[PDB]
Design a protein around this ligand. Structure first.
Ligand SMILES: *[C@@H]1O[C@H](CO)[C@@H](O)[C@H](O)[C@H]1NC(C)=O
Ligand SMILES: *[C@@H]1O[C@H](CO)[C@@H](O)[C@H](O)[C@H]1NC(C)=O
Ligand SMILES: *[C@@H]1O[C@H](CO)[C@@H](O)[C@H](O)[C@H]1NC(C)=O
Ligand SMILES: [Cl-]
Length: 290
């Protein structure tokens, strides 16, 4: 078992093939089949062809971040049934992941897809990832959150979606995420949230929605959040008239930690906080009650 190229090969704590920041233009040939950790980060790999690591049956960790990934083959990860961590982040020119790329990775615990320029989450992309706990999708180019996108992710605790261009939250965007603990949707273009979009998020404790385009929010959308303890809503154009009364009422009973809910309109209440207003301030109009 010769160590490929200028890689560093060692056995403890796990059999590791480390070849970082060597300017590699492709996955090196001859990676030992006993590899449990493969570090190919910081190079210049542009493609990941099919069965690139099929001999590493015991592969549990694979890092490909900070490369030049422009295309990943659909069968790139064939035979990696024991893969627990996959890192593809900091490849801002990836743009699109084939929807079959992650199939069969039933032991995957964490998946780093942040800063990959992702344009869309095609159907079936996260199918079958029943073990996944951490999913990093922030700092991409996402323009929609299709329904059932995380339907099989019953063990997901952390979903990072901030830093995209998501325009709204449909009803089934977060179906199945029963174990979800942290959900980060800030720094997007979220303008509306379906009243039942957070139906399965009864175990959620942190919800970040600041820096969006929310002008109102029906109190129904927060009602399923029985476990919530941190809520961010600042940097949104809140309308503080009759339409904000339900959100106002829910916030009066919230025992957790919440950010400012700054009023954008009317100018009389400019940058006042909704939770600190009186009910008499929320009368008249400036749909719904109007
Ligand atoms: C994976 O590990 C098992 C037991 O640790 C070993 O028998 C097997 O040969 C390994 N697979 C390789 C080296 O491809
Ligand atoms: C999901 O989590 C539960 C409890 O943490 C665990 O028993 C189960 O095996 C996990 N799912 C998978 C596919 O490992
Ligand atoms: C917010 O939504 C309004 C429509 O209600 C639209 O005119 C405006 O351009 C949006 N702003 C951003 C930053 O998305
Ligand atoms: Cl590690």
């Amino acid at each position: 078992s010769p160590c490929p190229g200028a890689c560093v090969c060692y056995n403890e704590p796990k059999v590791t093939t480390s070849c970082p920041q060597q300017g590699l233009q492709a996955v090196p040939t001859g990676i030992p089949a006993s590899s449990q950790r493969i570090f190919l980060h910081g190079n210049r790999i542009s493609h990941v062809p099919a069965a690139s690591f099929q001999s590493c049956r015991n592969l549990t960790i694979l890092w490909l971040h900070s490369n030049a990934l422009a295309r990943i083959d659909a069968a790139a990860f064939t035979g990696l049934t024991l893969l627990e961590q996959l890192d593809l982040s900091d490849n801002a020119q990836l743009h699109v992941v084939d929807p079959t790329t992650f199939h069969g990775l039933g032991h995957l615990h964490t998946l780093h897809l942040d800063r990959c320029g992702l344009r869309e989450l095609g159907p079936g992309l996260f199918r079958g990832l029943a073990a996944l706990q951490y999913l990093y999708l922030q700092d991409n180019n996402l323009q929609a959150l299709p329904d059932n996108t995380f339907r099989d992710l019953g063990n997901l605790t952390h979903l990072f979606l901030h830093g995209n261009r998501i325009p709204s939250v449909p009803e089934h965007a977060f179906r199945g995420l029963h174990s979800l603990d942290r959900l980060l949707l800030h720094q997007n273009h979220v303008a509306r949230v379906h009243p039942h979009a957070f139906r399965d998020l009864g175990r959620l404790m942190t919800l970040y929605l600041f820096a969006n385009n929310l002008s109102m929010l029906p109190a129904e959308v927060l009602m399923p959040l029985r476990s919530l303890q941190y809520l961010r809503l600042n940097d949104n154009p809140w309308v503080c008239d009759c339409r904000a009364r339900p959100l106002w009422a829910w916030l009066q009973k919230f025992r957790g930690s919440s950010s400012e809910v700054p009023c954008n309109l009317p100018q009389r209440l400019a940058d006042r906080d909704l939770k600190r207003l009186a009910a008499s301030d929320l009368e008249g109009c400036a749909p719904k009650c109007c």
